[PDB]
Amino acid sequence: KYTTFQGSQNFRLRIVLATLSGKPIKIEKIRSGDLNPGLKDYEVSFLRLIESVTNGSVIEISYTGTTVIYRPGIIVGGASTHICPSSKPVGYFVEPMLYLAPFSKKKFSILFKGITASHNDAGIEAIKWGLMPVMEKFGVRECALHTLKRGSPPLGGGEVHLVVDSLIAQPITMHEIDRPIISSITGVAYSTRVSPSLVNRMIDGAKKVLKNLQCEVNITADVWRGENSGKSPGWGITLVAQSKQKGWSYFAEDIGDAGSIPEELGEKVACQLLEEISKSAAVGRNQLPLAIVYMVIGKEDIGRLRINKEQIDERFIILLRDIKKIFNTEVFLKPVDEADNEDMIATIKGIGFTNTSKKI
Amino acid sequence: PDSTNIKL
């Protein structure tokens, strides 16, 4: 019948993984005990987005809204526009699409509208340089997120266009058992509807922390000014640690609220990126969910990915248990032979997924 | 200009 889950925990994946598998799923007891039970608008909006890029899928939400039945269709894609409710930014909706877009009948050219940043979801600049670079490593050669308008909270007004040109049968098998050597650190300091002095001060705060390092530091000042600057003033920084040896990235990102010091947050994110590096072996934590699934959906082949002990956390474990429930795939783990670090190798057999929706 | 003049 239907594999059953509980709660809103990992709502997007259980649908995304369901969509890729073709296996029907039931999500039940969604916030049953809360005063406002059931699905939230942004989650409902995500369901509308899933229907738009697919055909033949049946989505049934209970009368109380606490249970949803999802029978997946085929990924079809196409050109469309999606209005994102204010409760979540665009990155909330762009992220799941990255998981499905490269395996589509037609090209994904989806136009997103709403707030473009938040304290808890992926930013524009994170996706462009923090998640997407992983996709090229997995064989998604061409994928772009064009920034037509930035929208800061609370009024938003931003505009981002998601285009993936690479359509592939399945991602290449993953083989990385080493600790990447970071060559340089880059980033974009952006602000909307404000004075460019704020942008410079943040790079100053970021540079203050990171000047101790022996590698080059170059942070772009992307001040957005004019009609494309959104309807609210806002600002943020994302700093990316880059490895040109085999094309890898580690990144951190935060945005600022009213009354905060641009130098303070610039110091925070620059300090923040180092913690992500410290917890990273081959990938930072915030792209573990993206990389692991691609290994799972590879050919009938064992991929290898080096992970740190700091990365194997509750989020990692719940993610794995979700994968097994739906694919029956188990991520085996063997220790590294080195003693300098306690890094860890994740080995995954692919389920032999293929893009059967594309035309030959 | 002179600071004294412009304001006073």
Binding site: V194, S195, L198, P233 | S3, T4, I6, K7, L8
Partner: protein, 231 residues
């Protein structure tokens, strides 16, 4: 209402008592140059003074005498210093046509307002510490959002230099005075001139608003002090 503090052009700080009818204390070396601006915290225990020596000096009231606390030296001469009603912000005007905002508790730099072509003469902060107004000699009033330092609107209020602008208490409305001998009543939300007052024969050097906001007092170069009462 029993004491008055005065800042002179010679850099001296003077304190008077009404009951004694005499000067209690004088600080000859309060500043090396004219003490252009002087502001007090809401508690009334800390005094802020701006001078032509390019410094801001903080003073404490201890039983009554003044003691210098800290010196904040700026790159340029200071025209006006204002303390927010909540005592969280400190705004200072410089001859370089930029207004600098500081955090009163920690003296950390917060914002650098820019866009005035001539130096800012007066600064005033809303009762809620959200909106801040800057009036400069360039005949323009600029209303800024203190959350991000954003100029909501720039108003060509008067035909000459605008010396003083004050918020009405418990409201975003404000008044403005200029060398054109006209006092104008404005709406802080709609940004429109509510009323124009033509009584002054010459330049209007100072303006003050009652704590209740019932009346406003303006004095000019004609030696005339007049009281504008809300009817």
């Amino acid at each position: 209402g029993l004491l008055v503090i005065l800042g002179t052009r010679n850099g001296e700080l003077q304190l008077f008592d009404l009951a004694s009818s005499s000067l209690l204390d004088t600080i000859e070396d309060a500043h090396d140059a004219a003490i252009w601006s002087l502001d007090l915290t809401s508690d009334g225990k800390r005094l802020v003074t701006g001078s032509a020596d390019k410094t801001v000096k903080f003073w404490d009231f201890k039983v009554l005498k003044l003691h210098h606390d800290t010196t904040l030296e700026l790159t340029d001469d200071i025209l006006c210093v204002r303390v927010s009603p909540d005592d969280r912000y400190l705004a200072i005007s410089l001859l370089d046509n930029t207004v600098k905002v500081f955090f009163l508790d920690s003296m950390k730099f917060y914002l650098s307002l820019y866009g005035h072509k001539l130096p800012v003469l007066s600064i005033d902060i809303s009762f809620d510490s959200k909106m801040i107004i800057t009036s400069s000699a360039d005949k323009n009033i600029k209303i800024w959002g203190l959350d991000f330092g954003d100029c909501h609107k720039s108003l060509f209020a008067h035909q000459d230099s605008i010396m003083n602008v004050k918020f009405l208490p418990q409201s975003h409305n404000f008044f403005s005075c200029s060398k054109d001998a006209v006092v104008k009543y404005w709406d802080g939300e709609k940004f429109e001139c509510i009323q124009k007052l033509y009584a002054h024969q010459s330049e209007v050097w100072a303006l003050a608003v009652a704590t209740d906001g019932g009346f406003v007092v303006s004095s000019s170069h004609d030696h005339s002090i007049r009281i504008w009462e809300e009817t």
